């Protein structure tokens, strides 16, 4: 029952933190009032991230977001819609970051990372990495300029993770 419970984190900024941990079983440790997905402007929860999210919740996730496009048809490339987190989290925010590997513009992560400050506190993947193309390190440094709140970020990374250990200690 308590929620938020966000441990083992490096603070980047006073507002973005990392962990080098899988963001499934980083929910099931944190019970995050708000988890972000990285999703497609259509909520098809296949692949990558929005697939791992949509299996943890058995299908659940995919039924909602069919009923959402059904009455309020597809998000826009940077924008985002607030859902059930079902068992993983309180609130689900999708947020769609640009598909490199769809030509979509980089530069629309600043946008897709606007969308984390409607919330006050966050647990997110990096937006716009796996095959959406981003280099990771990349969309770290668009999420710490841009967010404005809390967010926890957890990356499955272990090459970008230790990468992101020592910018920060060349930073201090």
Not at 42 to 59: D, E, F, Q, S, W
Not at 65 to 91: E, F, M, R, W
């Amino acid at each position: 029952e308590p929620v938020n419970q966000f441990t083992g984190y490096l603070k980047l900024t006073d507002n973005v933190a990392i962990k080098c941990v899988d963001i499934v079983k980083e929910a099931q440790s944190a019970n995050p009032m708000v988890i972000v997905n990285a999703a497609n402007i259509h909520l098809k929860h296949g692949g990558g991230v929005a697939g791992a999210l949509n299996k943890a919740t058995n299908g659940a996730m995919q039924k909602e977001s069919d009923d959402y496009i059904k009455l309020n048809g597809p998000l826009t490339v940077g924008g985002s819609c607030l859902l059930s987190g079902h068992n993983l989290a309180k609130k689900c925010l999708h947020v769609v970051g640009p598909n490199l590997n769809a030509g979509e513009d980089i530069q629309l992560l600043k946008a897709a990372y606007e969308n984390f400050n409607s919330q006050d506190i966050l647990l997110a993947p990096l937006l716009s990495a796996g095959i959406f193309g981003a280099k990771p390190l990349q969309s770290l440094q668009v999420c710490v300029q841009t967010v404005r709140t809390q967010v926890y970020i957890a990356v499955n990374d272990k090459a970008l993770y230790e990468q992101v250990v020592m910018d920060y200690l060349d930073n201090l």
